[PDB]
Amino acid sequence: PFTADKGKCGLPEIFDPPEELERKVWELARLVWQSSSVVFHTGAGISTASGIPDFRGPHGVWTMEERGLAPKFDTTFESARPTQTHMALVQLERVGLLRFLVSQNVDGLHVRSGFPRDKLAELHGNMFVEECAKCKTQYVRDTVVGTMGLKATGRLCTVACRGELRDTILDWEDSLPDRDLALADEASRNADLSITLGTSLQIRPSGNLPLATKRRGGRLVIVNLQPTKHDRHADLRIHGYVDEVMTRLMKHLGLEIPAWDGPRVLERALPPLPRPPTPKL
Numbered sequence: 001p002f003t004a005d006k007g008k009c010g011l012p013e014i015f016d017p018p019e020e021l022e023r024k025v026w027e028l029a030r031l032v033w034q035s036s037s038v039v040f041h042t043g044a045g046i047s048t049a050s051g052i053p054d055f056r057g058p059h060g061v062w063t064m065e066e067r068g069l070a071p072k073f074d075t076t077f078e079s080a081r082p083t084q085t086h087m088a089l090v091q092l093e094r095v096g097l098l099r100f101l102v103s104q105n106v107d108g109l110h111v112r113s114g115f116p117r118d119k120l121a122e123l124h125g126n127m128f129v130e131e132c133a134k135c136k137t138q139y140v141r142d143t144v145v146g147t148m149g150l151k152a153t154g155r156l157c158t159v160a161c162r163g164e165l166r167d168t169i170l171d172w173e174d175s176l177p178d179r180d181l182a183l184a185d186e187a188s189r190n191a192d193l194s195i196t197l198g199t200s201l202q203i204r205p206s207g208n209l210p211l212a213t214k215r216r217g218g219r220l221v222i223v224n225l226q227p228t229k230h231d232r233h234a235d236l237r238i239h240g241y242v243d244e245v246m247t248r249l250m251k252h253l254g255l256e257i258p259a260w261d262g263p264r265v266l267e268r269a270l271p272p273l274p275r276p277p278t279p280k281l
């Protein structure tokens with residue numbers, strides 16, 4: 001909170017004009033269609049349309065802190081509903097168009113959305129997830145785990161164990177979880193397309209994973225209202241609200257954004273569902 005360096009905060013928003021936005025979302029369609037392995041990278045900007053403020057946007061947690069004001073929540077973590085973006089990603093995984101999802105978000109919404117945990121990396125941890133120090137068994141709770149920085153929560157392990165239970169929320173000095181970073185890095189190196197949604201890309205190594213896709217000729221799309229640390233490296237930069245982008249993409253792809261049934265946890269990806277045939281490009 002003092003020692004922490006918060007990167008650049010409160011940069012100006014960019015809006016693509018509506019005909020450029022429409023053109024660019026068609027090109028995002030064309031690239032999704034051309035690709036064999038698609039990885040999505042999400043940050044705090046996908047949850048802003050759910051009432052959860054971001055870090056470095058105009059009213060982000062850190063931006064407001066810099067000006068001596070508070071960020072504002074229009075929801076609790078528990079009562080937050082996944083966005084259209086969240087549900088678009090669920091569907092794109094179910095019809096096999098997303099190989100893997102890498103998220104810096106600690107907000108719990110991917111997991112509560114129904115997104116399979118074996119295709120998700122939560123680089124910064126999950127506020128609803130506690131982990132046994134002894135067996136490493138993870139517990140997805142209906143309520144936020146009351147501590148941050150990999151501290152004792154008060155709860156014991158209930159396996160076959162009685163290990164001390166601790167939060168998954170990284171402090172500034174904490175190493176990223178080895179499993180999640182290992183898988184996110186592998187998915188990012190093998191992708192032929194990395195699509196960044198609602199991240200400023202300013203945190204290392206989280207914000208560098210999409211760069212790994214450009215090695216051996218992969219393409220990079222950044223969707224973001226503000227500039228991001230790697231705009232220069234993008235084949236396609238879309239300045240728009242992620243909900244409007246992802247709903248036009250899904251319409252181009254012939255997909256519906258499915259219903260949210262309330263909080264549900266899926267450990268393992270299901271077999272792939274049908275998807276529409278590909279346009280000639």
Ligand SMILES: Nc1ncnc2c1ncn2[C@@H]1O[C@H](COP(=O)(O)OP(=O)(O)OC[C@H]2O[C@H](O)[C@H](O)[C@@H]2O)[C@@H](O)[C@H]1O
Binds near residue numbers: 046057
């Ligand atoms: N609806 C929206 N549509 C598109 N862009 C949006 C929207 N709302 C916000 N944005 C943009 O979304 C971007 C979000 O960027 P940042 O606030 O840096 O969040 P992170 O996920 O990268 O933070 C990384 C970590 O840093 C922290 O310390 C924690 O550890 C976090 O895990 C901004 O550029 C907004 O313009």
Ligand SMILES: Oc1cc(O)c2cc(O)c(-c3ccc(O)c(O)c3)[o+]c2c1
Binds near residue numbers: 044047052053107127
């Ligand atoms: O004012 C606070 C105090 C806290 O202890 C927080 C802990 C958090 O994990 C978050 C949080 C903030 C913004 C997000 O976009 C997010 O995913 C979590 O906010 C706090 C705010």
Ligand SMILES: [Zn+2]
Binds near residue numbers: 137157158161162
């Ligand atoms: Zn245990």
